[PDB]
Amino acid sequence: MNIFEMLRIDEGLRLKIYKDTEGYYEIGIGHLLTKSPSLNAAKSELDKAIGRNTNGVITKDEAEKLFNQDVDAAVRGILRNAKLKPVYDSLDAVRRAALINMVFQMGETGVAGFTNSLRMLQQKRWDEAAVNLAKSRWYNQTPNRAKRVITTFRTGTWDAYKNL
Ligand SMILES: [Cl-]
Ligand SMILES: [Cl-]
């Protein structure tokens, strides 16, 4: 199991522009197109992202290029971030994947404000951090996903992903 497998699991795959649970415009494997309401807009973006006149639809290949690009970006993001880096560095491999999952999902900005859990993570207070993580808009908005991630942080294993 790895980060790609993980995220593919959590984000699915769609060749069509679609709204996200947050109503926003996405495509592929969780590729955020735009925080605004114009399909025309998202569409523009799509085209720009792909470098061709897509018309709202892309190839698997395409989805994956974005995906590739997106994991890369998350990682760098983390690595450059002053609040993130220390956590990351302190963690084990599985747990790192979980971090990257969150940043992907919600952005480095978003994650960097999980200030408390971050500390707890850093101090390897796995159960407390999990509790903490759970008191979040994030959790309430996408419970099941949140749970998998949270577990991962909790256990340092891939169990929550095994079987699906
Ligand atoms: Cl892009
Ligand atoms: Cl969910």
CSV table of C-alpha atoms and ligand atoms in Angstrom, one decimal:
chain,number,residue,atom,x,y,z
A,1,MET,CA,0.0,0.0,0.0
A,2,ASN,CA,1.3,3.5,-0.7
A,3,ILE,CA,0.2,7.1,-0.9
A,4,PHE,CA,-1.1,6.7,-4.4
A,5,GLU,CA,-3.1,3.7,-3.6
A,6,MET,CA,-4.3,5.4,-0.5
A,7,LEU,CA,-5.5,8.6,-2.2
A,8,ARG,CA,-6.9,6.7,-5.2
A,9,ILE,CA,-9.0,5.0,-2.6
A,10,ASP,CA,-10.1,8.1,-0.8
A,11,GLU,CA,-10.7,10.3,-3.9
A,12,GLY,CA,-11.9,7.9,-6.5
A,13,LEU,CA,-11.7,8.7,-10.2
A,14,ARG,CA,-14.0,10.7,-12.5
A,15,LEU,CA,-13.5,11.7,-16.1
A,16,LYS,CA,-16.1,14.4,-15.8
A,17,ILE,CA,-16.2,17.6,-14.1
A,18,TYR,CA,-18.1,17.1,-10.8
A,19,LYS,CA,-18.9,19.0,-7.6
A,20,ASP,CA,-17.2,18.0,-4.5
A,21,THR,CA,-18.9,17.6,-1.1
A,22,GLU,CA,-18.0,21.2,-0.6
A,23,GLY,CA,-19.9,22.0,-3.8
A,24,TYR,CA,-16.6,22.9,-5.6
A,25,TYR,CA,-15.4,21.9,-9.0
A,26,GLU,CA,-13.2,18.9,-9.3
A,27,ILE,CA,-12.0,16.2,-11.6
A,28,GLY,CA,-10.0,13.0,-11.8
A,29,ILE,CA,-8.4,11.8,-8.6
A,30,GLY,CA,-9.4,14.7,-6.4
A,31,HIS,CA,-8.1,17.5,-8.7
A,32,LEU,CA,-9.5,20.8,-7.6
A,33,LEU,CA,-10.4,22.9,-10.4
A,34,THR,CA,-11.9,25.9,-8.7
A,35,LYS,CA,-13.5,27.3,-5.7
A,36,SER,CA,-16.1,29.2,-7.7
A,37,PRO,CA,-19.5,28.4,-9.3
A,38,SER,CA,-18.9,28.8,-13.0
A,39,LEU,CA,-18.9,25.5,-14.9
A,40,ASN,CA,-17.6,27.7,-17.6
A,41,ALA,CA,-14.9,28.7,-15.2
A,42,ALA,CA,-14.0,25.2,-14.0
A,43,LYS,CA,-14.0,24.4,-17.6
A,44,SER,CA,-11.6,27.1,-18.4
A,45,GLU,CA,-9.4,25.9,-15.7
A,46,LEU,CA,-9.7,22.4,-16.9
A,47,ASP,CA,-8.6,23.4,-20.3
A,48,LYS,CA,-5.7,25.4,-19.0
A,49,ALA,CA,-4.6,22.6,-16.7
A,50,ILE,CA,-4.7,20.1,-19.5
A,51,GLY,CA,-3.5,22.2,-22.3
A,52,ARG,CA,-6.3,21.2,-24.7
A,53,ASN,CA,-9.9,21.9,-25.5
A,54,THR,CA,-11.4,19.3,-23.1
A,55,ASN,CA,-15.0,20.2,-22.9
A,56,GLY,CA,-15.2,18.9,-19.2
A,57,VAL,CA,-13.9,15.5,-19.9
A,58,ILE,CA,-10.5,14.0,-19.8
A,59,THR,CA,-8.6,10.6,-20.3
A,60,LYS,CA,-7.5,8.3,-17.4
A,61,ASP,CA,-4.0,9.1,-18.5
A,62,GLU,CA,-4.8,12.8,-18.0
A,63,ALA,CA,-6.3,12.2,-14.6
A,64,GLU,CA,-3.2,10.5,-13.6
A,65,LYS,CA,-0.9,13.2,-14.8
A,66,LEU,CA,-2.7,15.7,-12.7
A,67,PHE,CA,-2.6,13.2,-9.9
A,68,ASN,CA,1.0,12.7,-10.2
A,69,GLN,CA,1.5,16.4,-10.2
A,70,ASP,CA,-0.7,16.8,-7.2
A,71,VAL,CA,1.0,14.3,-4.9
A,72,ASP,CA,4.3,15.9,-5.9
A,73,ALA,CA,3.0,19.2,-5.0
A,74,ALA,CA,1.7,18.1,-1.6
A,75,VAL,CA,4.9,16.7,-0.7
A,76,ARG,CA,7.0,19.8,-1.6
A,77,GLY,CA,4.4,21.9,0.1
A,78,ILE,CA,5.0,20.0,3.3
A,79,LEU,CA,8.7,20.0,2.9
A,80,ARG,CA,8.8,23.8,2.5
A,81,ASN,CA,6.3,24.6,5.2
A,82,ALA,CA,7.7,25.8,8.5
A,83,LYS,CA,5.0,24.2,10.6
A,84,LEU,CA,4.7,21.1,8.6
A,85,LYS,CA,8.1,20.0,8.0
A,86,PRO,CA,9.0,19.2,11.6
A,87,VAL,CA,6.0,17.1,12.0
A,88,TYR,CA,6.7,15.3,8.9
A,89,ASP,CA,10.2,14.7,9.6
A,90,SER,CA,9.4,13.4,13.0
A,91,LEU,CA,7.0,10.8,11.6
A,92,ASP,CA,7.2,7.3,10.4
A,93,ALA,CA,6.5,6.3,6.9
A,94,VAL,CA,3.0,5.3,7.2
A,95,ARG,CA,2.0,8.2,9.3
A,96,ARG,CA,3.7,10.4,6.7
A,97,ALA,CA,1.4,9.2,4.1
A,98,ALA,CA,-1.5,10.2,6.3
A,99,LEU,CA,-0.1,13.7,6.6
A,100,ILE,CA,0.2,14.0,2.9
A,101,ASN,CA,-3.4,12.7,2.6
A,102,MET,CA,-4.6,15.6,4.7
A,103,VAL,CA,-2.6,18.2,2.9
A,104,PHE,CA,-3.7,16.9,-0.4
A,105,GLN,CA,-7.2,17.0,0.8
A,106,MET,CA,-7.3,20.2,2.4
A,107,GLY,CA,-4.2,22.2,1.5
A,108,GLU,CA,-1.1,23.1,3.5
A,109,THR,CA,-2.8,26.2,4.9
A,110,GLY,CA,-5.7,24.1,6.1
A,111,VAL,CA,-3.5,21.5,7.7
A,112,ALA,CA,-1.1,23.9,9.3
A,113,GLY,CA,-3.9,25.1,11.6
A,114,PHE,CA,-4.4,21.7,13.2
A,115,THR,CA,-1.9,23.2,15.5
A,116,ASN,CA,-2.8,21.0,18.5
A,117,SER,CA,-2.9,17.7,16.8
A,118,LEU,CA,0.3,18.7,15.1
A,119,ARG,CA,2.0,19.0,18.5
A,120,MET,CA,0.5,15.8,19.7
A,121,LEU,CA,1.6,14.1,16.6
A,122,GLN,CA,5.1,15.4,17.0
A,123,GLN,CA,5.1,14.0,20.6
A,124,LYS,CA,3.8,10.7,19.5
A,125,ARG,CA,0.6,10.9,21.5
A,126,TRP,CA,-1.3,8.8,19.0
A,127,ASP,CA,-4.5,8.4,20.8
A,128,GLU,CA,-4.9,12.0,21.9
A,129,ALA,CA,-4.1,13.3,18.6
A,130,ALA,CA,-6.7,11.1,17.1
A,131,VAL,CA,-9.3,12.5,19.5
A,132,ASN,CA,-8.1,15.9,18.7
A,133,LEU,CA,-8.2,15.3,15.0
A,134,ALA,CA,-11.7,14.2,15.4
A,135,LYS,CA,-13.0,17.5,16.7
A,136,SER,CA,-13.1,19.1,13.3
A,137,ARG,CA,-15.1,20.5,10.7
A,138,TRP,CA,-13.2,18.1,8.5
A,139,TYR,CA,-14.2,15.2,10.4
A,140,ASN,CA,-17.8,16.1,10.5
A,141,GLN,CA,-17.9,17.0,6.9
A,142,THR,CA,-16.3,13.7,5.7
A,143,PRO,CA,-16.3,11.3,8.5
A,144,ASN,CA,-15.4,8.1,6.8
A,145,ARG,CA,-12.5,9.4,5.1
A,146,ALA,CA,-11.4,11.3,8.2
A,147,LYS,CA,-11.7,8.0,10.1
A,148,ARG,CA,-9.4,6.2,7.8
A,149,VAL,CA,-6.8,8.9,8.0
A,150,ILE,CA,-7.2,9.2,11.7
A,151,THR,CA,-6.7,5.6,12.2
A,152,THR,CA,-3.7,5.5,10.2
A,153,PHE,CA,-2.2,8.2,12.4
A,154,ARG,CA,-3.5,6.3,15.4
A,155,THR,CA,-2.0,2.9,14.5
A,156,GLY,CA,0.9,3.6,12.2
A,157,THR,CA,-0.5,0.7,10.0
A,158,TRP,CA,-2.6,0.5,6.8
A,159,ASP,CA,-5.5,-1.4,8.3
A,160,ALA,CA,-8.2,1.1,7.6
A,161,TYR,CA,-7.4,0.7,4.0
A,162,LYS,CA,-7.0,-3.0,3.9
A,163,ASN,CA,-10.2,-4.5,2.5
A,164,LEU,CA,-11.5,-1.9,0.0
B,1,CL,CL,-2.8,22.2,-12.6
B,2,CL,CL,-16.3,10.7,3.9
